[PDB]
Every structure is written in C-alpha cells, then in structure tokens.
Design an enzyme around this catalytic site. Structure first.
Site, PDB file in Angstrom:
ATOM      1  N   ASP A  35       0.848  -1.193   0.000  1.00  0.00           N
ATOM      2  CA  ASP A  35       0.000   0.000   0.000  1.00  0.00           C
ATOM      3  C   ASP A  35       0.882   1.241   0.000  1.00  0.00           C
ATOM      4  OD1 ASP A  35      -1.928   1.917   0.295  1.00  0.00           O
ATOM      5  OD2 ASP A  35      -2.457   1.352   2.353  1.00  0.00           O
ATOM      6  N   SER A 199      -0.384  15.512 -12.187  1.00  0.00           N
ATOM      7  CA  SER A 199      -0.589  15.137 -13.575  1.00  0.00           C
ATOM      8  C   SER A 199      -0.832  16.386 -14.407  1.00  0.00           C
ATOM      9  CB  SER A 199      -1.785  14.181 -13.674  1.00  0.00           C
ATOM     10  OG  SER A 199      -2.179  13.925 -15.005  1.00  0.00           O
TER      11      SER A 199
HETATM   12  N1  LIG Z   1      -4.301   3.365   0.572  1.00  0.00           N
HETATM   13  C1  LIG Z   1      -4.374   4.119   1.860  1.00  0.00           C
HETATM   14  C2  LIG Z   1      -5.699   4.908   1.999  1.00  0.00           C
HETATM   15  C3  LIG Z   1      -5.770   6.155   1.076  1.00  0.00           C
HETATM   16  C4  LIG Z   1      -4.703   7.255   1.341  1.00  0.00           C
HETATM   17  C5  LIG Z   1      -5.303   8.613   0.966  1.00  0.00           C
HETATM   18  C6  LIG Z   1      -6.799   8.384   0.891  1.00  0.00           C
HETATM   19  C7  LIG Z   1      -7.126   6.912   1.279  1.00  0.00           C
HETATM   20  F1  LIG Z   1      -7.571   6.785   2.546  1.00  0.00           F
HETATM   21  F2  LIG Z   1      -8.104   6.386   0.535  1.00  0.00           F
END
Ligand SMILES: NCC[C@@H]1CCCC1(F)F
EC number: 3.4.23.22
Length: 330
Positions: A35, A199
């Site tokens: 992640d 982007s």
């Molecule tokens: N994958 C970790 C969770 C993400 C990080 C920023 C927004 C979120 F919570 F969806």
C-alpha cells in the site's frame, strides 16, 4: 541488495493485489497488500480477536525466535474506506522477494474491522508511503522500504501491476525489460506523507488532450481512479446510459457498453488506460448495471491514482533524498 516479488490479484476484478512476505524465524509467509498510500506494516496474528479472523493466515510471534516485543508500542489506523485495525508491535526479520530487513516493526492486530475479516485473501498490509504517516506510538516506526533503503543498490522500488494477471514489485533496481519507451519522472511532494504528484492533464477516448494540473497520489492500496468531478463527468458522458447513482455509491454504466480509454499526463508523456480496465463488473450478481473504475474524488479530499491508473504503467517510486515518481508505458 535487491528484492523481487510477484503480486497477484485477489479476485477476477483486480480489487486488490497480494504479495507474499516472509516474517520471522523460521519464516511465516503471509500475503500482504502493498500500500503506497499508508505506512504501517500490520498483520493478522495470534493476538487478533478470534471472532475477527476468518480464513487469514496469522503471524504467531511466539513461534519466531527473532521476534521481540516492542515494549509499550501500540498502533491504530483508519483508512479511506472506513476500515480500521489496531494492536501492539513486535520487531522481527521481514523478507520480500529475497530482500531482508532485520528489526522491522511488525504491527500485530488485536482488532480489525469487518471489511478485513470478510476478506480472507489479505493477511495484512505493507505500507510504502513515507514513514511520517506511521501510526506507532509513542515511538514512530519506519516502513520496510525506509529500513531497506541504505542497503539497496538504488533507493527505489517499482510497481508493475497486471490487468487481470500477476505483476511485480521490485526493490533496489529498475528492470529495463519491463517497460516500453522511456520513463518520465515527475516531482513529488511529501508534505502529506504520500507519493503526491501533479498530472498534466487528461483525454477521454480519442478526444483531444486537456492540459490541466491534477494533484493526486500514487496509491497501490486503492483499487480505483478518483479524480475531480469535472474530469469524471467528462469521461462518463461518453458512455451511453452511464450515471452517478447515490444508492450504489458512484458512477454505474450498462454492462453492455464498450468503455473508452482514459489518458493521463505525466509531464509531456501520456499513459493510456484501456477501457476494459475501467470495468468493475455487475454491481450485484446478475445485474446489468456495472460499476465504473473512474469515480469522483469529491468526498475524499484528495485525488487518487489507484490501481486502475497504476496498472497501465510501470511505476518508479524513487526514494532518493529528493523523491520523484517515474511512469512508463508497458
Ligand atoms: N491506501 C491508503 C488509503 C488512502 C490514502 C489517501 C486516501 C485513502 F484513505 F483512501
């Protein structure tokens, strides 16, 4: 040193990807969700409330001769989907694809929320965002990548996610056979703890490219592509019968549709997401309404280049003193 591990979709929709990770001595292999949007390495464990474990492989620190309680340390995290987990902390030896870190903080779950229990294929998470987001208290801990970085041949890792197929996470080297053309690098802000970048615009299908700055994060732990409502409306307007459904929770489209591609800009370069990557299948078994893979970020507070976008590219997470991101077609 380097490491290289295969990452595999958990289901036929690519809802997430799991990568085997060796923890402890003798090794206990758990399948973790890598992640890049979070910074905790946590696992289902022998300490997890029994009623909250349903098919996951657990880490048992008492069976590891290298495990040590990190005395007094606790952790607690909540994610954007409303899921959460918490527990205590051990240090142990952790290896990914042949790359070994000693003394890695392994966060043992005492509690997990229902969405984790209900997903028997994910044994925990391995965070790869910046260590400033790590939740361990009172002594914040470093990610696996931060701990490995000095030993790596180059201070980088790469994500090469497959569409309905396995892919690869590499640590410490760039596999020049894994992409076509050149890698375009772009600046990163670490101010929010994410791999946050801008982007340069987008196109829908064969349409003209719209030059516009879109700040967002490269997040392997998010399934879909979340972008501003203007961009998302422009995409779904090209699909007959597509609509935003409050009852379902986003854009849906007729399963009979052929979806257009979506292009995003990386500097002067362009990454093309094929239309099929945007199909997340029937909203419920047997339905002819299908869930879209491009959704509005309006409720979230940040744009998210999740797996839908990243799997169209070979992505370099460059952890040099000034971090950058690289994208190549493949
Ligand atoms: N994958 C970790 C969770 C993400 C990080 C920023 C927004 C979120 F919570 F969806």
């Amino acid at each position: 040193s380097t490491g290289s591990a295969t990452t595999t979709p958990i289901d036929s929709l690519d809802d997430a990807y799991i990568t085997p990770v060796q923890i402890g001595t003798p090794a206990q292999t758990l399948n973790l969700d890598f992640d890049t949007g979070s910074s905790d390495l946590w696992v289902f464990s022998s300490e997890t409330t029994a009623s909250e474990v349903d098919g996951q492989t657990i880490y048992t620190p008492s069976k590891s001769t290298t495990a040590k309680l990190l005395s007094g340390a606790t952790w607690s995290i909540s994610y954007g989907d409303g899921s959460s987990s918490s527990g205590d902390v051990y240090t142990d030896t952790v290896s990914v694809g042949g790359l070994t870190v000693t003394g890695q903080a392994v966060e043992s779950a005492k509690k997990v929320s229902s969405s984790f229990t209900e997903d028997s294929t994910i044994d925990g998470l391995l965070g790869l965002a910046f260590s400033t987001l790590n939740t361990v208290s009172p002594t914040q801990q470093k990610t696996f990548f931060d701990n490995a970085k000095a030993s790596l041949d180059s201070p980088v890792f790469t994500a090469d996610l497959g569409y309905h197929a396995p892919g690869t996470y590499n640590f410490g080297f760039i596999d020049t056979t894994a992409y076509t053309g050149s890698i375009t690098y772009t600046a990163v802000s670490t101010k929010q703890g994410f791999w946050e970048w801008t982007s340069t615009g987008y196109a829908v299908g064969s349409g003209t490219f719209k030059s516009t700055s879109i700040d967002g994060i490269a997040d392997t732990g998010t399934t879909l592509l979340y972008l501003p409502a203007t961009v998302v409306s422009a995409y779904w307007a090209q699909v007959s019968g597509a609509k935003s459904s409050s009852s379902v929770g986003g854009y849906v489209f007729p399963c009979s549709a052929t979806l257009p591609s979506f292009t995003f800009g990386v500097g002067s370069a362009r990454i093309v997401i094929p239309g099929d990557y945007i199909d997340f299948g029937p909203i419920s078994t047997g339905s002819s309404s299908c869930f879209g893979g491009i959704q509005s970020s309006a409720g979230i507070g940040i744009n998210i280049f999740g797996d839908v976008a990243l799997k169209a590219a070979f992505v370099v997470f460059n952890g040099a003193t000034t971090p950058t991101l690289g994208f190549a077609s493949k």
